[PDB]
Amino acid sequence: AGASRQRKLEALIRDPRSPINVESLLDGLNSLVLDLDFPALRKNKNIDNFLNRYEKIVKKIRGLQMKAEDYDVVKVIGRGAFGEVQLVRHKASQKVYAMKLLSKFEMIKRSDSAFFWEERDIMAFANSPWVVQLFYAFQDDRYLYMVMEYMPGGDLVNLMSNYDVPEKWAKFYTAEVVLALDAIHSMGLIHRDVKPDNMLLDKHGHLKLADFGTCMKMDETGMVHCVGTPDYISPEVLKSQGGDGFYGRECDWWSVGVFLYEMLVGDTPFYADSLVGTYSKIMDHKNSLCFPEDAEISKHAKNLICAFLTDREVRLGRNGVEEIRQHPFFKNDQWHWDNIRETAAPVVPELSSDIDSSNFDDIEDVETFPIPKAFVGNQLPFIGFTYYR
Amino acid sequence: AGASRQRKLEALIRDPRSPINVESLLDGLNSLVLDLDFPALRKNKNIDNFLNRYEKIVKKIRGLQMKAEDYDVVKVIGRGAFGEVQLVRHKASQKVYAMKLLSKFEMIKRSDSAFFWEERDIMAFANSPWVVQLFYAFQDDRYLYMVMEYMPGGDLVNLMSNYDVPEKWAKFYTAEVVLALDAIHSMGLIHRDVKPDNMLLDKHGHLKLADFGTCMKMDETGMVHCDTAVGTPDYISPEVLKSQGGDGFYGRECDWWSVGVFLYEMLVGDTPFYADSLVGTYSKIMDHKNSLCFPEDAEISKHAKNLICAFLTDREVRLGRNGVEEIRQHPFFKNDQWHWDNIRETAAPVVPELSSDIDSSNFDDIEDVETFPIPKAFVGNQLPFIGFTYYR
Numbered sequence: 106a107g108a109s110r111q112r113k114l115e116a117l118i119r120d121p122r123s124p125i126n127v128e129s130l131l132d133g134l135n136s137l138v139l140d141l142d143f144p145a146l147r148k149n150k151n152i153d154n155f156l157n158r159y160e161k162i163v164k165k166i167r168g169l170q171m172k173a174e175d176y177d178v179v180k181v182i183g184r185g186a187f188g189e190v191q192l193v194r195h196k197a198s199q200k201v202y203a204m205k206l207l208s209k210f211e212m213i214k215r216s217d218s219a220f221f222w223e224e225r226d227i228m229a230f231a232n233s234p235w236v237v238q239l240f241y242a243f244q245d246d247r248y249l250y251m252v253m254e255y256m257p258g259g260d261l262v263n264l265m266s267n268y269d270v271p272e273k274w275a276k277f278y279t280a281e282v283v284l285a286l287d288a289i290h291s292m293g294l295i296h297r298d299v300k301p302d303n304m305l306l307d308k309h310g311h312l313k314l315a316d317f318g319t320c321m322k323m324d325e326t327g328m329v330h331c332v333g334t335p336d337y338i339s340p341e342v343l344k345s346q347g348g349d350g351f352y353g354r355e356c357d358w359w360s361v362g363v364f365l366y367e368m369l370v371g372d373t374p375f376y377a378d379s380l381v382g383t384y385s386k387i388m389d390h391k392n393s394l395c396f397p398e399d400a401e402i403s404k405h406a407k408n409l410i411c412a413f414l415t416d417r418e419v420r421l422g423r424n425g426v427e428e429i430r431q432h433p434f435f436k437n438d439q440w441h442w443d444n445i446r447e448t449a450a451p452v453v454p455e456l457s458s459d460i461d462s463s464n465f466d467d468i469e470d471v472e473t474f475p476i477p478k479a480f481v482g483n484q485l486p487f488i489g490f491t492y493y494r
Numbered sequence: 495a496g497a498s499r500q501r502k503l504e505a506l507i508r509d510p511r512s513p514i515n516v517e518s519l520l521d522g523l524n525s526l527v528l529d530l531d532f533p534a535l536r537k538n539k540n541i542d543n544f545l546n547r548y549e550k551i552v553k554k555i556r557g558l559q560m561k562a563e564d565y566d567v568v569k570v571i572g573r574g575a576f577g578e579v580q581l582v583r584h585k586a587s588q589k590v591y592a593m594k595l596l597s598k599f600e601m602i603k604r605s606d607s608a609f610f611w612e613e614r615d616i617m618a619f620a621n622s623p624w625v626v627q628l629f630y631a632f633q634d635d636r637y638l639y640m641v642m643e644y645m646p647g648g649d650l651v652n653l654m655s656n657y658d659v660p661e662k663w664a665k666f667y668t669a670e671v672v673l674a675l676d677a678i679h680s681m682g683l684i685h686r687d688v689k690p691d692n693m694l695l696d697k698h699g700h701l702k703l704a705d706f707g708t709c710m711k712m713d714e715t716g717m718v719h720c721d722t723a724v725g726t727p728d729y730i731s732p733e734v735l736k737s738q739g740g741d742g743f744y745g746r747e748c749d750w751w752s753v754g755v756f757l758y759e760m761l762v763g764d765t766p767f768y769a770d771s772l773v774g775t776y777s778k779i780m781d782h783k784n785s786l787c788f789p790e791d792a793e794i795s796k797h798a799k800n801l802i803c804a805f806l807t808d809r810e811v812r813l814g815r816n817g818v819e820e821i822r823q824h825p826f827f828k829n830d831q832w833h834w835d836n837i838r839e840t841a842a843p844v845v846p847e848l849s850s851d852i853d854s855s856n857f858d859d860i861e862d863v864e865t866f867p868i869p870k871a872f873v874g875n876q877l878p879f880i881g882f883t884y885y886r
């Protein structure tokens with residue numbers, strides 16, 4: 106009946122995962138207002154009269170909703186392709202978060218614009234201690250904001266540059282990465298850009314993955330038809346960039362092997378001065394993968410590294426994560442796969458307060474959209490991005 | 495804290511009086527989809543990706559929401575400037591309604607496009623038995639719809655044309671118009687288009703006002719500021735005629751001129767300033783001091799004649815400056831069938847003979863489409879109708 110219909114649609118609006126939830130529909134009207142309030146378009150009677158009604162309530166609404174002015178910015182802890190990351194303190198609650206800003210301009214211009222949906226879903230609804238939790242997602246006219254839990258231990262790029270990593274440490278950080286990727290794979294997602302920059306460390310020095318712009322949802326077969334600095338990117342993913350090309354979750358396990366090599370060796374296995382150099386070496390990995398004479402690595406460590414860095418058809422982890430996690434290398438008298446994250450981490454950070462950012466390096470140093478004549482609708486891609494947990 | 499804000503905003507979305515209630519925000523999404531889904535606009539990647547996402551969910555919502563296909567059209571019972579009015583039966587409930595279609599194309603074309611807000615607000619939130627009530631307001635691509643209560647008795651244009659009205663009946667219906675107009679004034683609204691076309695009679699033959707397109711919201715004093723003259727030529731007050739030519743300040747008195755014109759029509763059988771051209775009618779209305787006169791062959795009583803000349807005078811001396819009180823205590827109204835407090839619970843003059851719930855014998859038959867052009871740029875023809883949807 107009509108009563109049954111209104112019950113059904115009210116379910117579609119209260120659903121926080123729905124595209125027509127109240128935050129999306131409020132995003133829709135706010136995106137419509139921002140996209141229309143220009144003097145050139147206001148010559149149109151339909152557009153000017155529409156703004157006359159809603160201009161008042163839209164300014165009110167935007168005041169009540171969560172915004173950047175609510176958060177005191179303590180420091181900038183990272184920079185990235187489409188923006189930056191800030192250490193922030195929410196003023197009303199005094200709680201410390203890490204807030205990621207992604208530029209709407211840069212996303213629209215350089216033309217990626219769909220990566221942030223999966224990132225937002227994964228961080229909100231992953232519900233895994235291997236993935237950084239998102240608390241709030243919101244936006245203004247220039248930026249998207251993602252308010253995440255603050256990983257105060259820094260990343261593994263910092264850990265490797267400040268410590269010469271022994272093999273017992275390498276077992277730990279590799280095992281945690283394996284578990285973290287298994288978490289993502291189990292959500293039906295291929296990471297396809299795993300690397301120490303995206304591997305953060307929590308309060309107790311335990312790993313959580315932190316960037317998911319590259320993530321993509323798998324098929325029934327498990328494959329994913331569809332960019333970057335190629336250091337950690339597998340051969341098949343590299344070949345795939347040339348036109349079409351299928352690949353699966355094994356591409357992430359290549360990256361793990363690259364990551365294992367780096368920790369024990371100190372350089373990436375396919376390092377070169379140019380991108381074409383690195384690309385070229387990654388394709389000729391059968392001949393170009395080699396260990397230095399003066400880099401004391403064990404038989405099992407070398408065996409695992411060689412297991413991962415091979416063709417996809419015989420790589421470690423086609424048959425499953427099992428054979429990876431029962432490789433001899435991981436045998437130890439400290440932790441087990443079922444209890445690793447509650448055991449003592451190799452490196453616990455010594456921090457003084459809730460805003461201690463000492464394990465992050467310092468960051469040093471504008472343009473936005475042009476005023477349009479016609480309707481371009483730049484805000485339309487960002488409708489339904491707002492999320493309040 | 496943030497808790498105080500998210501409760502304040504939640505107050506705004508749940509309220510059906512609010513412009514940002516959920517019904518309106520759905521219209522915001524729906525209108526955007528309609529206004530972008532065209533081949534040339536999909537050449538924009540921003541537009542085409544947005545419509546690739548939402549079109550499916552927007553298609554499911556459109557089927558769930560109330561629509562015209564829910565109703566059986568029994569017979570078309572009226573026509574007006576911006577659309578028609580149909581007699582409908584809701585399929586799921588079998589309940590009879592009169593629903594008014596209003597063409598979005600013609601409203602944008604002839605440019606008015608905001609009269610319907612106060613029409614909707616009155617019917618939705620009047621709660622007076624002098625005003626036809628709106629159960630459901632909705633829309634689609636072409637029409638705004640308003641599902642009202644069916645008034646099977648017909649309008650007063652039909653009553654005066656069928657029956658030859660005596661003054662005992664005219665006391666009654668004029669009284670009901672005054673109480674109806676007083677109600678509308680008591681909501682801060684000048685009707686400024688009172689006439690027998692817009693007076694409908696219910697199951698029992700008691701009046702209800704039933705078109706509010708010309709209606710406008712008053713000031714803190716009671717006056718209104720309007721540049722354009724409005725209303726049907728025959729019943730337009732000289733002050734509203736004179737408002738066309740520049741600055742026009744005037745209060746609720748303009749309605750009583752029309753009640754004046756209305757009473758003259760009932761007893762005399764023709765409208766007081768009739769002319770074969772509209773140009774002549776405006777010339778007669780402006781010269782009402784000399785032009786207003788009765789035929790000799792006419793049996794209108796002195797108290798009847800005293801009331802009409804009381805109404806059809808300049809606003810400075812018109813019966814209505816000192817409120818509704820002075821209208822009610824005129825000797826024409828004084829009788830022993832009804833009091834003012836109980837008039838609508840007394841025996842009406844013309845109780846209709848109604849066989850069935852779809853009896854449209856009081857209304858007459860009707861006899862005899864164009865649409866928007868496919869735009870190249872963003873034009874936004876659905877933006878004036880965002881927030882029109884309403885469910886009781």
Ligand SMILES: COC(=O)c1ccc(F)c(NC(=O)c2cccc(-c3cc(C(=O)Nc4ccncc4F)ccc3CN)c2)c1
Nearest residue numbers: 182184185186187188189203254255256302315316318333
């Ligand atoms: C190169 O082409 C690509 O593959 C590609 C394509 C699309 C993309 F969106 C991106 N990534 C970004 O644009 C991007 C923008 C801004 C910040 C980051 C970023 C954030 C974090 C973080 O949240 N840390 C963090 C988390 C919690 N507590 C403290 C923290 F410090 C970590 C690392 C990074 C760099 N990965 C990434 C990359």
Ligand SMILES: COC(=O)c1ccc(F)c(NC(=O)c2cccc(-c3cc(C(=O)Nc4ccncc4F)ccc3CN)c2)c1
Nearest residue numbers: 573574575576577578592643644645691692704705707725
């Ligand atoms: C001349 O310019 C204006 O003053 C002006 C400006 C803007 C406007 F929107 C309009 N009105 C319309 O366009 C319009 C369109 C379609 C139907 C009507 C209309 C409807 C009714 C009705 O609801 N009856 C009714 C009610 C309940 N149960 C059964 C009924 F039968 C009565 C009378 C009428 C004519 N007034 C009016 C007029």
